[PDB]
Amino acid sequence: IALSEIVSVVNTSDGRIEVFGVGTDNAVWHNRQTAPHSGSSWTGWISLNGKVTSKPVVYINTDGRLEVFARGTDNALWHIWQTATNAGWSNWQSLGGTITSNPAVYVNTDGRIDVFARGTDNALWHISQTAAHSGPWSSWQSLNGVITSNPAVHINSDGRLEVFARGTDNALWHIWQTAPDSNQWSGWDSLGGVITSDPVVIGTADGRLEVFARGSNNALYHIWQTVPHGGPWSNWASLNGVITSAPAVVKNSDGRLEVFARGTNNALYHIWQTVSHSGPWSNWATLNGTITSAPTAVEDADGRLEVFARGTDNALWNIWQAWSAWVSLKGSLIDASAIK
Amino acid sequence: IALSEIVSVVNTSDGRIEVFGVGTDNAVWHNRQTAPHSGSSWTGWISLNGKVTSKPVVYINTDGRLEVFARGTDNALWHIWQTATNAGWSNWQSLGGTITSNPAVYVNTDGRIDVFARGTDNALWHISQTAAHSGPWSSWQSLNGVITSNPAVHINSDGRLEVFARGTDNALWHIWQTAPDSNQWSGWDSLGGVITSDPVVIGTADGRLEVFARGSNNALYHIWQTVPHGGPWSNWASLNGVITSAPAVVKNSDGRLEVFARGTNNALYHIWQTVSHSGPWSNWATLNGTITSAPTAVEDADGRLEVFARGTDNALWNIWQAWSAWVSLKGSLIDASAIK
Ligand SMILES: OC[C@H]1O[C@@H](O)[C@H](O)[C@@H](O)[C@@H]1O
Ligand SMILES: OC[C@H]1O[C@@H](O)[C@H](O)[C@@H](O)[C@@H]1O
Ligand SMILES: OC[C@H]1O[C@@H](O)[C@H](O)[C@@H](O)[C@@H]1O
Ligand SMILES: OC[C@H]1O[C@@H](O)[C@H](O)[C@@H](O)[C@@H]1O
Ligand SMILES: OC[C@H]1O[C@@H](O)[C@H](O)[C@@H](O)[C@@H]1O
Ligand SMILES: OC[C@H]1O[C@@H](O)[C@H](O)[C@@H](O)[C@@H]1O
Ligand SMILES: OC[C@H]1O[C@@H](O)[C@H](O)[C@@H](O)[C@@H]1O
Numbered sequence: 001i002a003l004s005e006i007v008s009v010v011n012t013s014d015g016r017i018e019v020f021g022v023g024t025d026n027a028v029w030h031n032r033q034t035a036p037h038s039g040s041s042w043t044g045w046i047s048l049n050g051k052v053t054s055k056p057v058v059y060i061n062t063d064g065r066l067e068v069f070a071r072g073t074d075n076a077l078w079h080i081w082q083t084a085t086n087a088g089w090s091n092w093q094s095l096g097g098t099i100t101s102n103p104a105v106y107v108n109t110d111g112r113i114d115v116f117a118r119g120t121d122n123a124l125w126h127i128s129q130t131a132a133h134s135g136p137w138s139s140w141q142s143l144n145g146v147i148t149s150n151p152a153v154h155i156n157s158d159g160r161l162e163v164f165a166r167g168t169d170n171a172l173w174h175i176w177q178t179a180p181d182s183n184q185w186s187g188w189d190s191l192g193g194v195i196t197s198d199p200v201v202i203g204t205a206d207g208r209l210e211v212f213a214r215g216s217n218n219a220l221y222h223i224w225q226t227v228p229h230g231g232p233w234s235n236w237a238s239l240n241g242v243i244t245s246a247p248a249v250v251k252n253s254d255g256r257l258e259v260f261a262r263g264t265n266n267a268l269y270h271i272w273q274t275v276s277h278s279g280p281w282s283n284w285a286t287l288n289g290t291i292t293s294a295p296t297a298v299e300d301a302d303g304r305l306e307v308f309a310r311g312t313d314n315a316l317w318n319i320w321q322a323w324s325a326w327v328s329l330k331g332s333l334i335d336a337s338a339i340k
Numbered sequence: 341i342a343l344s345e346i347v348s349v350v351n352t353s354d355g356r357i358e359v360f361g362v363g364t365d366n367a368v369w370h371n372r373q374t375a376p377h378s379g380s381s382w383t384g385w386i387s388l389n390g391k392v393t394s395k396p397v398v399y400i401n402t403d404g405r406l407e408v409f410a411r412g413t414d415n416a417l418w419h420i421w422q423t424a425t426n427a428g429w430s431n432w433q434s435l436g437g438t439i440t441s442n443p444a445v446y447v448n449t450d451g452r453i454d455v456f457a458r459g460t461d462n463a464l465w466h467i468s469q470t471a472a473h474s475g476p477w478s479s480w481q482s483l484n485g486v487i488t489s490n491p492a493v494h495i496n497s498d499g500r501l502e503v504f505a506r507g508t509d510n511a512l513w514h515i516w517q518t519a520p521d522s523n524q525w526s527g528w529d530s531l532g533g534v535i536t537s538d539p540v541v542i543g544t545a546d547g548r549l550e551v552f553a554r555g556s557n558n559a560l561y562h563i564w565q566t567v568p569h570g571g572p573w574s575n576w577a578s579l580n581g582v583i584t585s586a587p588a589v590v591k592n593s594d595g596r597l598e599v600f601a602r603g604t605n606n607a608l609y610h611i612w613q614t615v616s617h618s619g620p621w622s623n624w625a626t627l628n629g630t631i632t633s634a635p636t637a638v639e640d641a642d643g644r645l646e647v648f649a650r651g652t653d654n655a656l657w658n659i660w661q662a663w664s665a666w667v668s669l670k671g672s673l674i675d676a677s678a679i680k
């Protein structure tokens with residue numbers, strides 16, 4: 001499994017990027033832009049406390065309240081939430097279970113958050129809010145299978161959640177809701193290939209799921225739905241390169257997909273659709289730097305991509321689509337990924 | 341009340357703009373882009389039938405299914421929906437009531453559509469889906485007040501719906517949910533001024549509501565929340581000009597607000613935030629043409645603004661942010677607005 005993303009990042013409901021990482025104390029720390037603009041100053045790192053043994057994953061509830069999910073020292077799923085949109089936080093609360101992966105998080109069309117995690121049986125399990133952005137939470141329920149990666153989740157353009165994970169054959173497997181808001185899940189399907197990273201999944205500007213992963217030759221690969229929210233899937237296509245981290249994918253403000261990955265020389269590299277969305281891909285270009293994590297990419301409130309990655313000093317470094325000079329957000333981050 | 345928008349327009353879940361208008365037969369007709377790109381060809385006009393006595397208002401359910409709301413010849417609220425995302429349509433069904441305005445439509449954080457309409461008592465009434473993108477619908481419920489315009493609705497950045505309408509004093513009044521998904525609504529509040537158009541409301545890139553309306557001197561005015569999802573509101577500010585239609589507002593792909601209105605010479609005019617979102621406004625610029633409706637503006641799948649307006653030939657004409665040459669979508673549209 002290629003070197004993981006070190007932070008979870010979201011553009012908040014007031015247009016400020018907030019990042020969540022694990023400190024040397026194994027607590028979750030957050031940093032937020034002071035202003036909703038490219039090159040904004042930052043609040044600085046503020047602790048949510050806790051003791052996590054996974055990558056923390058933030059998600060924005062449909063009412064704008066941020067909610068962080070992370071495995072605890074007891075291997076239970078824990079969570080903590082803003083009590084008001086972009087305001088104070090709750091205490092950490094357990095959702096129980098015994099999980100063996102980072103959580104994957106998305107929200108159903110009914111505003112109910114769905115959290116996916118590998119179990120001690122190596123099956124995909126999930127637990128959900130029973131009301132929109134509200135407790136109580138459901139029971140833990142199994143979707144079966146045997147997965148050898150952290151899971152990834154994205155909603156289809158018809159509101160059906162779809163989960164991607166590596167199988168015991170190192171192929172990309174996936175499973176989907178057969179209707180929105182449903183616990184009627186499909187059987188597992190193999191999209192084949194051999195992946196040596198966690199999969200990442202995004203929705204194209206024309207409403208198709210597209211999955212990126214590193215292959216056995218350390219090139220970037222991708223595969224996509226050929227119709228909106230539907231099969232068949234394309235064959236695997238190489239985007240080439242030699243990458244030494246997990247890839248991070250993001251949509252430009254004009255819908256062009258752009259992928260960030262660490263190269264052999266430990267610099268940040270990127271490759272993008274040219275002209276328009278679902279257009280022909282560029283060749284790889286360097287953004288330089290020296291990074292000790294996978295990059296994490298998000299669009300800011302000015303419609304510019306922002307990239308975060310840990311540096312050799314273990315601080316979180318930022319670069320944005322002007323491109324800008326590398327700047328440090330400081331702090332000291334660790335890779336707490338449940339699967340490495 | 342300044343000349344109204346003639347179509348309801350949405351960017352569908354597969355990145356194709358679809359427009360809804362009233363034909364000379366008083367049926368609702370729709371036209372959709374063949375491709376999810378600027379300057380795409382169109383399907384041509386296809387009838388949903390019905391007999392409407394209001395502007396038709398389309399909304400995308402959280403599962404991607406389009407749903408159109410319009411007053412019938414019996415003055416009841418009627419609706420029709422796609423049975424699958426971007427697929428076939430249902431028959432028209434009545435939601436009953438007796439309404440005296442165009443419908444205003446938004447979705448709650450729980451995926452429940454909320455429809456607002458003036459009653460025969462000139463009070464603001466509403467009816468909602470009781471489950472996410474699903475029937476049965478609620479009873480009609482009154483929010484009281486006396487309104488002299490079509491209502492406008494937008495969600496706050498904390499998930500609270502907020503409705504704007506002109507009062508008997510010709511001032512801008514508003515009312516809001518005190519919590520998301522709630523029928524706990526606030527009292528009416530006056531934002532003062534004198535408006536001679538329907539209000540239009542948008543959410544800024546930094547999570548604030550901003551309202552645009554024509555004033556007594558036929559200038560464009562605007563007023564905004566000074567904090568995300570919160571008061572106090574600004575004082576009214578003039579964006580000047582002399583406009584002879586309702587203004588239409590839209591966010592650029594980079595969050596810059598842009599406003600479209602008909603000028604004294606019947607040409608399309610526009611004015612925009614410069615540099616970045618919540619930045620200083622341009623002066624008015626012409627896009628020429630000769631229009632016989634207010635313009636309607638939406639962002640396409642390429643991140644470019646598209647504007648629609650009826651021409652002197654009663655066809656719907658299109659121009660986009662390249663700017664492009666005016667092109668005709670043909671058809672023959674009427675202004676069916678319930679309040680003129
Ligand atoms: O108050 C809202 C919060 O309530 C908690 O009980 C739930 O577990 C959270 O998921 C929710 O966001
Ligand atoms: O029914 C829809 C489903 O069809 C399957 O064949 C595809 O592999 C899934 O990605 C899709 O969600
Ligand atoms: O076409 C725009 C593209 O051009 C490149 O020069 C930039 O570095 C990319 O981030 C961008 O997506
Ligand atoms: O629809 C086909 C296109 O989908 C895009 O999102 C992919 O990145 C392209 O490689 C592909 O040609
Ligand atoms: O099937 C979905 C549709 O069902 C109808 O009964 C409801 O009235 C619509 O609002 C809904 O979109
Ligand atoms: O409580 C929030 C509400 O506060 C009021 O003072 C504002 O006028 C409303 O726009 C806002 O939604
Ligand atoms: O800064 C970009 C702006 O420049 C003007 O020339 C265009 O006509 C506007 O549509 C655009 O928003």
Ligand SMILES: OC[C@H]1O[C@@H](O)[C@H](O)[C@@H](O)[C@@H]1O
Pocket residue numbers: 544550564577597613617618619
């Ligand atoms: O926050 C203040 C700013 O809000 C913007 O959305 C308005 O268009 C500006 O006129 C105003 O200066």
Ligand code: NA
Pocket residue numbers: 007008009057058
């Ligand atoms: Na994340």
Ligand code: NA
Pocket residue numbers: 347348349397398
């Ligand atoms: Na509309």
